[PDB]
Motif scaffolding. Structure first.
Motif, PDB file in Angstrom:
ATOM      1  N   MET A  64      55.101 -15.720  32.197  1.00 53.78           N
ATOM      2  CA  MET A  64      55.954 -15.781  31.024  1.00 53.78           C
ATOM      3  C   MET A  64      55.136 -15.600  29.757  1.00 53.78           C
ATOM      4  SD  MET A  64      59.015 -18.428  30.596  1.00 53.78           S
ATOM      5  CE  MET A  64      57.985 -19.886  30.650  1.00 53.78           C
ATOM      6  N   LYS A  65      53.867 -16.010  29.786  1.00 55.71           N
ATOM      7  CA  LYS A  65      52.977 -15.785  28.655  1.00 55.71           C
ATOM      8  C   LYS A  65      52.824 -14.298  28.374  1.00 55.71           C
ATOM      9  CE  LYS A  65      49.611 -16.034  25.676  1.00 55.71           C
ATOM     10  NZ  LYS A  65      49.994 -15.873  24.249  1.00 55.71           N
ATOM     11  N   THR A  66      52.532 -13.511  29.408  1.00 56.90           N
ATOM     12  CA  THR A  66      52.458 -12.067  29.237  1.00 56.90           C
ATOM     13  C   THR A  66      53.752 -11.524  28.649  1.00 56.90           C
ATOM     14  OG1 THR A  66      50.889 -11.833  31.060  1.00 56.90           O
ATOM     15  CG2 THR A  66      52.179  -9.902  30.460  1.00 56.90           C
ATOM     16  N   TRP A  67      54.878 -11.854  29.279  1.00 57.05           N
ATOM     17  CA  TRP A  67      56.135 -11.266  28.832  1.00 57.05           C
ATOM     18  C   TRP A  67      56.429 -11.621  27.379  1.00 57.05           C
ATOM     19  CZ3 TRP A  67      57.999  -7.212  30.660  1.00 57.05           C
ATOM     20  CH2 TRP A  67      57.954  -6.925  32.024  1.00 57.05           C
ATOM     21  N   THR A  68      56.160 -12.859  26.970  1.00 60.73           N
ATOM     22  CA  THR A  68      56.398 -13.212  25.578  1.00 60.73           C
ATOM     23  C   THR A  68      55.376 -12.587  24.641  1.00 60.73           C
ATOM     24  OG1 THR A  68      56.798 -15.046  24.057  1.00 60.73           O
ATOM     25  CG2 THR A  68      55.036 -15.327  25.683  1.00 60.73           C
ATOM     26  N   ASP A  69      54.158 -12.326  25.121  1.00 59.53           N
ATOM     27  CA  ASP A  69      53.201 -11.575  24.320  1.00 59.53           C
ATOM     28  C   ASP A  69      53.743 -10.196  23.988  1.00 59.53           C
ATOM     29  OD1 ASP A  69      51.380 -13.591  24.166  1.00 59.53           O
ATOM     30  OD2 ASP A  69      50.107 -12.854  25.793  1.00 59.53           O
ATOM     31  N   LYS A  70      54.364  -9.535  24.964  1.00 60.90           N
ATOM     32  CA  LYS A  70      54.949  -8.229  24.677  1.00 60.90           C
ATOM     33  C   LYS A  70      56.159  -8.301  23.758  1.00 60.90           C
ATOM     34  CE  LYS A  70      53.410  -5.786  28.746  1.00 60.90           C
ATOM     35  NZ  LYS A  70      52.370  -6.795  29.073  1.00 60.90           N
ATOM     36  N   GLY A  71      56.543  -9.480  23.284  1.00 59.89           N
ATOM     37  CA  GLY A  71      57.692  -9.615  22.419  1.00 59.89           C
ATOM     38  C   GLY A  71      59.019  -9.725  23.131  1.00 59.89           C
ATOM     39  N   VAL A  72      59.040  -9.660  24.456  1.00 62.46           N
ATOM     40  CA  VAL A  72      60.278  -9.861  25.198  1.00 62.46           C
ATOM     41  C   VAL A  72      60.475 -11.354  25.419  1.00 62.46           C
ATOM     42  CG1 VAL A  72      59.992  -7.618  26.295  1.00 62.46           C
ATOM     43  CG2 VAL A  72      59.233  -9.642  27.507  1.00 62.46           C
ATOM     44  N   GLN A  73      61.688 -11.836  25.180  1.00 62.75           N
ATOM     45  CA  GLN A  73      61.961 -13.238  25.430  1.00 62.75           C
ATOM     46  C   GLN A  73      61.974 -13.502  26.930  1.00 62.75           C
ATOM     47  OE1 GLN A  73      65.427 -13.100  22.151  1.00 62.75           O
ATOM     48  NE2 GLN A  73      64.771 -15.174  22.693  1.00 62.75           N
ATOM     49  N   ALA A  74      62.133 -14.772  27.285  1.00 55.13           N
ATOM     50  CA  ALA A  74      62.263 -15.186  28.674  1.00 55.13           C
ATOM     51  C   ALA A  74      63.368 -16.223  28.757  1.00 55.13           C
ATOM     52  CB  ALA A  74      60.953 -15.753  29.232  1.00 55.13           C
ATOM     53  N   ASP A  75      63.926 -16.378  29.952  1.00 57.44           N
ATOM     54  CA  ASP A  75      65.052 -17.276  30.144  1.00 57.44           C
ATOM     55  C   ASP A  75      64.932 -17.919  31.514  1.00 57.44           C
ATOM     56  OD1 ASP A  75      67.549 -18.566  29.866  1.00 57.44           O
ATOM     57  OD2 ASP A  75      68.252 -16.898  28.622  1.00 57.44           O
ATOM     58  N   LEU A  76      65.453 -19.139  31.639  1.00 54.49           N
ATOM     59  CA  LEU A  76      65.234 -19.944  32.832  1.00 54.49           C
ATOM     60  C   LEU A  76      66.523 -20.586  33.316  1.00 54.49           C
ATOM     61  CD1 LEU A  76      61.946 -21.538  31.635  1.00 54.49           C
ATOM     62  CD2 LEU A  76      62.181 -20.366  33.806  1.00 54.49           C
ATOM     63  N   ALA A  77      66.670 -20.658  34.637  1.00 57.69           N
ATOM     64  CA  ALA A  77      67.677 -21.478  35.294  1.00 57.69           C
ATOM     65  C   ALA A  77      66.997 -22.256  36.409  1.00 57.69           C
ATOM     66  CB  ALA A  77      68.820 -20.636  35.855  1.00 57.69           C
TER      67      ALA A  77
END
Lengths: 136, 171, 235, 284, 117, 86, 117
Positions: free
Chosen positions: D102-115
């Protein structure tokens, strides 16, 4: 006769060879004899009639699913609970509500609960490592 | 013969010894406290026919005599490893260990299997009892650890469910 | 002193003491009677000398020798207590009998993992005997925990690298049984006297995979290995 | 200290060793039952995937959203976690892997979401501050698909509604009794198997009423089935981890008794000596 | 002296019943701690309520403690003791709140106190 | 063991509390004052009754402080109230 | 001499913080011994890691111990040590490994030692 599998996401509900079946397909009742041409359809909730080889009839209750007839096999991918859109949407609404208000249910494991409580009480105020001079 | 408390004889001997200034030993019991119980319990014996004939100068010929002894000891908090209890456990031929956790739970008499034993054993047992009671003791010794496992485990294998129910019948 | 008289005749003698711990305790009682000050945990002040003046008379002399087998009781199960601690300064070997090994029907019920001897060194007993004893020791003390796995997870959980260790350990464990000339009244089988050479051969064999082709009960109560092969023949 | 305190402590540590031995036995039996409930789940997913394989990109094909690699602007995760502690490092290894990606994905500026499945992850990600939108908890050792319908419904709805662009399930994989591994794996858009139904050229289905309405429900049911399989493997892995944790704890208790008893014997000897010396050297 | 031949089966049964209820509540305390009470059976929640009421009802105000708390003391016969504890164990008072039993005295005074709560 | 028997009360100071930051390191679960509420102003007598039980229930629950994540919220409130009054 | 009036509030407060962390670490050593470290809450693991870092950081090389370890002695001023311990406690050095603190002088030597592992 042909081979039939009725399987859920959780468990296998039926297997073995069959003479014929009758199913309430989504678009109307239906009946599968051997050699039936390949077919795919949803099915409504209700009983599915089997007649096992040697004519032994039985009814299985299916809450719905998908029926897939293949050249020599037929499998019914039944499901565990009634499915729709009015229902699954209520399930999703409650799944969101439990996440907004931080509502956490307990598990049902009374065994682990008792064992964990005994283990926590036994290890309390034990102070062993001050006493056996284990350097750690 | 039944010695109602040989712990209290040991206490009385310690008293009447210290009052004579005799040097004490471990736990302040006199040096020879082991010899006190030893020279007593070694009189409990079975004696053969020739000793009986010689002692009584031929008045009795066929008989053999005996004197059984059931000394009673009291342990603090179930500690078998105190001085006097572990002295006497090294003198006798067995012990019947009466467990308080059983007595208060309504199991009476509270005989504790496993930790209690008879070192002459079946040689003294009558034939029918020897035949019918062979399995009871180890069966209970194992049942009472299985019942300690049982508290944490629900959903028990039927194989052990049989063992538990049977052990509970016999208990 | 009776054993010393026999030694002076040039024989090799064996002296049994029914409990050395009671030989210590009798000295403690006598010392208290004489009024001497008590010492380490209540023992007499002359504990180690009373023990040494006995244990120092049983030795191998240029004319003969006295060997001694002494039953030892350890108070409070404490091997640090002055009496066990003083006695162990004199013992060479140490054999531990176990209720368990008897329950499994193996006699003599010696425990191979706690029994020890300070004669087990290549410089005294030889290299082959040393590494053979060490072998069987390591095999059995691995089996001791493979059988722990089997209890919780069942047999078929084991690698086949281990199903071999179990099958060799069981055979080694059986082969340590023996029929005594004194046990015939129980076993019926005639007693056997097994030379050392025979035992080294037998255990080298079993360990290094030879004799894998015959079942474990061909070893039980047999004697030498040349008899294990025959008991497997007529099995 | 003193013989009595140390004897009480030895007693309590022996009791602890009893408890952990029992928990190891129980965990082993539940591992067996859970890895039977695991194997029982394969046929459904395995045949549904062949159906989808024939219908989606076989000798004919369709253009359903869940099959195409559109542009990633934010991601969703379904996280499986235990409901019970004493499972060893399982949950934390999993959560650290998840946070690392999730760190990588948020570095690219894409948000993340969890269930969240299970309450341990719920509490953890509430403590870290992740965005949790749906949860189900308290399934215990009785997972059922009818409970998973909610949280996966939320993520599917948010996927085809265009508010997600990729969907993962993150869970442990039960491989061998002594080894379990955390894995993040993708389940939307559908990953492409090497199974070839070019041999199925010989036929096509009769579709009642039509193939487009059927492919949709097949894909939804398949996603729900894979989430259920993930939950069940994670449950068998929880059991296989608690087993080894409790085995280690029983061995540690056993190795601690042997030190407490040396301390105890030393205290016993010291007390005998001090008492007997006070008596003798006090007299006269 | 707590055996039926001397105290009679009524008293012996009441005493062992009370001990059994409290001994079971001691079991249930830690399940209540870890899993919360709403997970208990419908019989176990009743055992919890009756154990808590029995546990309250054993307390009593003394005539000589009046200097400590100002509350007036009570003398309770054995007949009323057995009657009260048997009534509690047998559900005759499942309708009263727990605190109606605290420092109450005799069992009639628990029903007189509950009205005030 | 003699002076604990002569006196009307005992204040027990414990080094584990003293190191853990609790100063004055009084141990309330083992200290006793036999004169009790008679030696208090009535406001303090009224208000200390709740502190005694707030700490007693906390001492009964203390064991779970090292498993507190597992506890039900009905007891977690008692535990985190005992920590605050302490 | 350890009083707020004698050594100032910052020195006193840092000393008591160090004591509190190390005592809290002593309290956890038995549960760690039995159940292993993975059973600690997510923040008790933080307490433990900081406690071990502090344990390391109290070590120091001495000019009279060069004969033993070869490492040259270090002289650490008070101003220079209460700052390092305030840092370790407040969390500003979590990135460094434990062995970065073992046998060093000021805290800059620890951040500088981490570069070599």
């Amino acid at each position: 006769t042909y081979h039939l599998d009725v399987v859920s996401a959780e468990q296998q509900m039926f297997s073995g060879l069959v003479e014929k079946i009758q199913v309430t397909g989504s678009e109307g009742e239906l009946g599968i004899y051997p050699g039936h041409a390949p077919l795919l359809t949803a099915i409504k909730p209700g009983m599915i009639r089997i007649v096992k080889q040697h004519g032994h009839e039985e009814f299985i209750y299916l809450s719905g699913g998908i029926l897939e007839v293949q050249p020599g096999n037929v499998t019914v991918l039944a499901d565990t609970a009634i499915r729709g859109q009015d229902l699954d949407e209520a399930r999703a609404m409650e799944a969101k509500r439990k996440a907004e208000e931080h509502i956490s249910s307990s598990h049902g494991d009374v065994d682990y609960a008792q064992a964990s409580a005994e283990l926590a009480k036994a290890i309390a105020q034990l102070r062993v490592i001050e006493l056996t001079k284990k350097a750690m | 013969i039944i010695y109602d408390d040989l712990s209290k004889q040991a206490v009385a001997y310690r008293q009447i010894s210290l009052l004579l200034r005799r040097p004490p030993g471990r736990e302040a019991f006199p040096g020879d406290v082991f010899y006190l119980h030893s020279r007593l319990l070694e009189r409990a014996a079975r004696v053969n026919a020739e000793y009986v004939e010689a002692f009584t100068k031929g008045e009795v010929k066929g008989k053999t005599g005996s004197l059984t002894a059931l000394p009673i000891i009291e342990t603090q908090a179930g500690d078998v490893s105190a001085f006097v209890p572990t002295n006497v456990i090294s003198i006798t031929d067995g012990q019947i260990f009466l467990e308080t956790n059983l007595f208060n739970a309504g199991i009476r008499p509270a005989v504790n299997p496993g930790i209690s034993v008879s070192r002459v054993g079946g040689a003294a047992q009558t034939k029918i009892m020897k035949k019918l009671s062979g399995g009871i003791r180890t069966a209970l010794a194992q049942y009472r650890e299985l019942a300690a496992f049982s508290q944490f485990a629900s959903d028990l294998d039927d194989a052990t469910r049989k063992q538990l129910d049977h052990g509970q019948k016999v208990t | 002193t009776m054993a010393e008289k026999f030694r002076d005749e040039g024989r090799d003698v064996l002296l049994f003491v029914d409990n050395i711990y009671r030989y210590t305790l009798a000295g403690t009682e006598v010392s208290a009677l004489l009024g001497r000050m008590p010492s380490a945990v209540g023992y007499q002040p002359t504990l180690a000398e009373e023990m040494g003046v006995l244990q120092e008379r049983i030795t191998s002399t240029k004319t003969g020798s006295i060997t001694s087998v002494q039953a030892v009781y350890v108070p409070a199960d404490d091997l640090t207590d002055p009496s066990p601690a003083t006695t162990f300064a004199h013992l060479d070997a140490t054999v531990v009998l176990s209720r368990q090994i008897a329950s499994l029907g193996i006699y003599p019920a010696v425990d191979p993992l706690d029994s020890t001897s300070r004669q087990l060194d290549p410089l005294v007993v030889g290299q082959e005997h040393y590494d053979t004893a060490r072998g069987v020791q390591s095999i059995l003390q691995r089996y001791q925990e493979l059988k722990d796995i089997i209890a919780i997870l069942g047999m078929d959980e084991l690698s086949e690298e281990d199903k071999l260790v179990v099958a060799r350990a069981r055979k080694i464990q059986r082969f340590l049984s023996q029929p005594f000339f004194v046990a015939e009244v129980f076993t019926g089988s005639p007693g056997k006297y097994v030379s050392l050479k025979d035992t080294i051969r037998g255990f080298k064999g079993i360990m290094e995979g030879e004799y894998d082709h015959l079942p474990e009960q061909a070893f039980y109560m047999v004697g030498s290995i040349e008899e294990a092969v025959e008991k497997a023949k007529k099995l | 200290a003193g013989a009595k305190d140390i004897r009480s402590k030895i007693a309590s540590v022996q009791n602890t060793q009893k408890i952990t031995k029992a928990m190891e036995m129980v965990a082993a039996s539940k591992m067996r039952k859970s890895q039977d409930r695991m194997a029982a789940s394969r046929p459904y997913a395995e045949t549904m995937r062949k159906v989808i394989g024939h219908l989606a990109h076989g000798n004919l094909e369709y253009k359903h959203p869940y099959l195409e690699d559109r542009d990633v602007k934010r991601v969703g995760y379904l996280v499986v976690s235990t409901d019970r502690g004493l499972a060893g490092g399982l949950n934390i290894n999993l959560f650290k892997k998840l946070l690392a990606e999730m760190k990588t994905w948020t570095d690219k500026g894409v948000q993340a979401d969890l269930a969240m499945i299970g309450s341990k992850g719920v509490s953890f990600f509430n403590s870290v501050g992740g965005n949790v939108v749906a949860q189900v908890t308290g399934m215990g050792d009785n997972p059922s698909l009818s409970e998973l319908i909610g949280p996966v419904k939320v993520m599917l709805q948010a996927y085809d509604e265009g508010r997600l662009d990729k969907l993962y399930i993150v869970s442990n994989k039960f491989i061998n009794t002594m080894s379990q591994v955390p894995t993040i794996s993708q389940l939307l858009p559908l990953p492409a198997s090497d199974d070839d139904d070019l041999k199925h050229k010989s036929w096509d289905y009769l579709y009642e009423p039509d193939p487009k309405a059927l492919l949709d429900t097949l894909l939804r049911r398949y996603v729900e089935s894979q989430v259920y399989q993930g939950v069940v493997e994670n449950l068998a892995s929880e059991q296989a981890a608690r087993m080894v944790a409790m085995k280690a704890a029983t061995d540690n208790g056993g190795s601690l008794i042997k030190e407490l008893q040396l301390v105890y014997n030393k205290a016993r000897q010291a007390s005998i000596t001090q008492e007997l010396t006070e008596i003798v050297s006090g007299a006269a």
